[PDB]
Amino acid sequence: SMSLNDFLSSVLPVSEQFEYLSLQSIPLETHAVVTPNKDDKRVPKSTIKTQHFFSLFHQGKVFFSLEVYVYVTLWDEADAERLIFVSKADTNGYCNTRVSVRDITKIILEFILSIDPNYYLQKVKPAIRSTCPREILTKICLFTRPASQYLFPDSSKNSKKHILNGEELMKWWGFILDRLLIECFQNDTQAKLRIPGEDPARVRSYLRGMKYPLWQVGDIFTSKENSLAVYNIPLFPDDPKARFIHQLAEEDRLLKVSLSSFWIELQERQEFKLSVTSSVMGISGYSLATPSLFPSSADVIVPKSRKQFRAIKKYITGEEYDTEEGAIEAFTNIRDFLLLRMATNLQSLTGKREH
Ligand SMILES: CC(=O)SCCNC(=O)CCNC(=O)[C@H](O)C(C)(C)COP(=O)(O)OP(=O)(O)OC[C@H]1O[C@@H](n2cnc3c(N)ncnc32)[C@H](O)[C@@H]1OP(=O)(O)O
Ligand SMILES: [Hg+2]
Ligand SMILES: [Hg+2]
C-alpha cells in the first residue's frame, strides 16, 4: 500500500524537486448530503464530512491546487457509502518545469480512494460506530464547468496558464475518471456522464471512445427519471445542482419538479443556456482492492482547529496571482507557518516518471 508521497513522485517528472501540501480537516458530523424523504424506510444515521485540500509547489512557487470533499454516510448499523466529491482544481503556471496536471490529479484521487473509511470515523467526537470497508459503496461526483480561476485569484493573467474550454475540460476529467474506473473499480461499476447542453446521442457518441465498458449517459442519482429531484440530488458546496435546488425551494416547487424536468430546467439558469460547456460525471461502485490505508503524518497534516485549517488554506486561496510574487509568497507563508507553529516541513519528493 503506497503513500501519497509514493503516489505523487511516481507521476511527477524524473529527478526533479517538488514539495506538497496535504491539508485535511477534522471529520465532522453534519447534515444528510441528500435531503431525506419521510416516505423512505432508509434515512442516514450519520453523515461524516471532511475536506482534503492539496497543493503542489516547484522551487518555492505553488502552481496547482485540488479541493476534495469526502462524505461517509452510515445507514443501518451495517450499510455505508463514501462519496468523494471533487470541488475545485486550479493551476497558475508558475512552475519552471512541465508536469502532467492530468496525472497528478488522477493519482491524488487514487490516494483519497485508498483511504479506509474508518480513518474518518475514528476522529469524530464522540466515537462513531465503524463500518466494514470491504463492503462500503464508494461514489465520485464532479461537475465540469471551465473557468478563469478557482483557487488562485487573478492567475487568469499570467500569460502561460493553460485553461481548457468546456469540452476540452470535459474530455480531461473524462480521461481521469476512466483511468480510475479501469484500475480501481469492479467490472460492474456505474459510470455516468450527462451534459445538460443536450444532444443525448452526442454524449453517447463521445463515451464510445472510453476504455471502461460501462459508461452511459445519465447520472448516478437518477434511477427512475420520474422521482423528485429533492430526494435524489446531492447538495454539495458551491455546486450548481445545489444552487438550483435552493431556487426550487424559493418557488415552492420542490414537491413538484421531477429528476427528469430537473435536468431539462437546470440548463436555462444563466449558468448555461449555451454559455460554455458543462458536464456532470458520476461513479458508483465497489473498489477493486478494499481500502485500508490510514494516512500518516507524511501523507496528511490535520490542523486541530477549524480556524487553523482555514488559516493555512487562506494562504493559498487568498493571494494575488496576477504576478509570480503570489506563487512565491503562498509558498513562503505555508512553509513558514508549518515550521513555526506546527513544527512540520512540507513533505518533499524527487520525481521519478521518465519521459
Ligand atoms: C473539479 C472541477 O470540475 S473544476 C473545473 C476545471 N477547472 C478550471 O477550469 C479552472 C481553470 N483551469 C485550469 O486551471 C486548467 O485548465 C486545468 C488545471 C484544468 C488544466 O491544466 P493543464 O496544465 O492544462 O493540464 P495538463 O498539463 O494535464 O494538460 C495540458 C497539457 O496537455 C496537452 N494537451 C493539449 N491537448 C491535448 C489532448 N487532446 N490530449 C492530451 N493532451 C493534450 C498540452 O501539453 C497542454 O499543455 P499547455 O498548457 O502547454 O497547452
Ligand atoms: Hg509550468
Ligand atoms: Hg487502484
Q: Could you state, in order of their start, the residue ranges of all structural domains in the chain?
A: 1-355
Ligand 1, atom 24, lies closest to the CA of 162
Asked if residue 294 belongs to a known ligand binding site, the reply is no
- Specify the residue for cell string 444563466: 270
- Residue type at 164? L
Ligand 1 near 162 CB (within 6 A): yes
Distance CA 4, CA 202 (A): 37
Ligand 1 near 86 CB (within 6 A): yes
Asked if residue 33 belongs to a known ligand binding site, the reply is no
Chain centroid offset of residue 181 CA: 15
CA angle 307, 312, 313 (to 5 degrees): 95
CB 285 within 8 A of CB 138: yes
Distance CA 197, CA 68 (A): 25
241: cell is 445542482
Ligand 1 near 339 CB (within 6 A): no
Of 20, 22, 44, the residue nearest 33 (C-alpha): 44
Strands 62-74 and 190-194: unpaired
Please report the resolution in angstroms.
3.1
Active-site residue flag, 239: yes
244: cell is 438550483
260: cell is 427528469
Measured from the CA of 160, which atom of ligand 1 is nearest? Answer: 49
How does DSSP assign 218-248, residue by residue?
A: S-SS-SSTTSBGGGTS---TT-HHHHHHHHH
